[PDB]
Amino acid sequence: SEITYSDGTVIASIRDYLYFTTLAEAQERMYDYLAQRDNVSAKELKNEATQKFYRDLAAKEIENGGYKITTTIDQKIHSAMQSAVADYGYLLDDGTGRVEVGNVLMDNQTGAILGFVGGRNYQENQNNHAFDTKRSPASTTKPLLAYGIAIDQGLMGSETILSNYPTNFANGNPIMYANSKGTGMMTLGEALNYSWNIPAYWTYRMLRENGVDVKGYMEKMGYEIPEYGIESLPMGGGIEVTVAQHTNGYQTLANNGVYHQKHVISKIEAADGRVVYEYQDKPVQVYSKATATIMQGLLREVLSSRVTTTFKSNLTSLNPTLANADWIGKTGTTGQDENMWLMLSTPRLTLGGWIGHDDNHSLSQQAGYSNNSNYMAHLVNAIQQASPSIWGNERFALDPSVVKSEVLKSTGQKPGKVSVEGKEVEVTGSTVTSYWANKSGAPATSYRFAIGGSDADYQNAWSSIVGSL
C-alpha cells in the first residue's frame, strides 16, 4: 500500500503531518466504501459498535492491502512549505511564548490542496493546525458574510457609505475596535482596509432586516454555523473554522464566485485498478461574478493600503517580481489577540494562514500586522521558488456584468434633492464611480444614506455635508 503525490511519486507505504493527514482522510474514504460494499444500511451504521469496527476495518484494509492513494499534494511545493516553517517559523515568536501556525495552499479552479503547514514542528507538537484545530476567523468573516452578501443582494455597492459612529451591543456595552469606540461615516473601502467593526455590525443588521438567506450562502461553501442570531457574527463571533475550510471560502471569492470543495485525496484504487474512491467535482455559483470581482477589487486595496498588514512590503523586499502578481487578501484579529489570520489570493491560488496558541492565550499586538505578515511573505516566496509559475501572472478584473453608477463621494449615492429638517437641499460636490451587483446600480441619494447610524449620527453627518457645498 502507498500514498503518492499528484504525479504518482510515492510519499510512503503503509512520521509527519503529510503522512497522518493523507492517511486519515484515506481511511475515511475506505470506511464509506466498505460500509457500502458490505451492504450496511445507514441505519445500522448509527450503532457505534459497528462504526468502530468499520473504522478499524478501513485502517487494516490500507495496512494490509495493495491500494494506491492519489493525493493532490504537490511535492516540490509542500517540501518548500516545510523548509520555510522550519527556517522562518521562529519569526512568529512575539514574546508571548511559542506561537503555533497552520497554512493551506489551494488551487482556485479545483479546490485541490497543494501543500499545507500543520504546525512549527510535528516532533514537538502533533496537533494539526491546518486540518483539525478550529478558531474564530475574526474579521476575515466580513468579506464573506457581511459585505459580499450585501453586494450580491444588491443592497450596497463598492463606494457605498457606512456608519462607524459609536453604538452598543443590545446588552449596553459599546462595540469596540482596538480601543476605539468609533469615529464617523466612511466608505466601504475604508471600513475594509481598516477592518472596523461597527460598519460590519450594521451590514449584518440590514441583511437580517431584509430577511436575507445568509445561511444559504455560508452552507454552499461548507461552513457550519450553529446560530445566525448573533450580533457579532460578521466579526467572527459564534463561528469556528479550520484553516482548510476557511481557505475554501476565500477560494470562492477568488474564483469569481464559484465554489469547488476542498480535497487532499483525488482517488483511491485497488492494486487491480478498481476505483474504491474518486473525487467528484461539484461547482456552485455562490456569489454572482459581479459580486466576486467587485470584492476582489476591494480586497486588492486591503493589502495595498498596508493598514492592518505589512504583507506587501515584506514580499516586495523578498521578491519584487512576485509582489507584482495581483495579490488580494484580508487579515483577522480576535478580541484579545488570541488569533491572527491572513488570507491571500492571486487568480490561481489561495493561501490561508492562521497563528495563535493552542491554549488560546493572547499574542502580542502586532503578531498579525507584522510577524504573520512577514512569515507568510517568506512562505509565499518559498512556494514560488519551488514552482515558479504556480501563482501565475493573471489579473483579477471587473466582470462585464458589473454595473457602474456615478455617485457623490460623500453619500455614495446619486445626487438629487434631499430633505433636512425643513428645506430641500441640492445635494452636490465631488463624485466617484461606484460598482454594483444588481440591475440598476446605486439609488437616488436619500437622507438615511449610510448603512446604519442613529438620528444624531445623521444630524451630525448632514451638518458636515451641508457646510461644504
Ligand X SMILES: *[B-](O)(O)CNC(=O)c1c(F)cccc1F
Q: Contact positions toward a copy of itself, by CB under 8 A?
A: 169-173, 205, 208, 227-233, 235, 237-238, 334-336, 338
In 3D space, the residue among 152, 393, 158, 199 whose CA is nearest the CA of residue 297 turns out to be: 158
Q: At its nearest, how many Å lie between ligand X and the CB of residue 145?
A: 12
Binding mask 289-308 for Cl ion (x = CB under 5 A): x--------------x-x--
- At 115, give phi and psi (nearest 5°): 180, 155
Judged by CB under 5 A, the number of residues near Na ion is 6
From residue 420 to residue 449, the character string flagging contacts with Cl ion as x (rule: CB under 5 A) and all else as - is ---------x--xx----xxx---------
> Segment 369-428, which members bind Cl ion (CB under 5 A)?
405-406, 408-410
List residues forming the annotated binding site: 222, 224
* Residue number with CB closer to a copy of itself (233 or 294): 233
Query: 189 or 238: whose CB is closer to a copy of itself?
Result: 238
405 binds, among Cl ion, a copy of itself, Na ion, none (CB under 5 to 8 A by kind): Cl ion
Nearer to a copy of itself (CB atom), residue 85 or residue 207 = 207
Cβ closer to a copy of itself: 173 or 440?
173
* Sequence letter at residue 433: T
214 binds, among Cl ion, a copy of itself, ligand X, none (CB under 5 to 8 A by kind): Cl ion
By the rule CB under 5 A, 331 interacts with Na ion: yes
CB-nearer residue toward ligand X: 28 or 301: 301
CB of 333 to Na ion, least distance (A): 4
Q: How far apart are CA 370 and CA 32, in angstroms?
A: 44
Should residue 139 be labelled a site residue for Na ion when binding is judged by CB under 5 A?
yes
How many whole angstroms from its chain centre is CA 367? 18
The nearer residue to Na ion, 232 or 308, going by C-beta atoms, is 308
Annotated binding site for Mg(2+): 222, 224
The rounded distance, in Å, linking the Cα atoms of 347 and 326 is 7
Q: Which of the choices Cl ion, a copy of itself, ligand X, none does residue 88 contact, using the CB cut-off of 5 to 8 A by kind?
A: none
Q: Residues in the site for ligand X, rule: CB under 6 A?
A: 136, 138-139, 171-172, 195, 197, 232, 235-237, 332-335
Q: Among 237-245, 300-308, 382-390, 430-438, which window interacts with Na ion (CB under 5 A)? A: 300-308
Nearer to a copy of itself, 153 or 232 (CB): 232
Footprint on this chain of Cl ion (rule: CB under 5 A): 5-7, 16-18, 20-21, 25, 74-75, 128, 173, 214-215, 223-224, 228-229, 241, 245, 263-265, 270-272, 288-289, 304, 306, 310, 312-313, 357-359, 405-406, 408-410, 429, 432-433, 438-440
Footprint on this chain of Na ion (rule: CB under 5 A): 139, 195, 308, 331-333
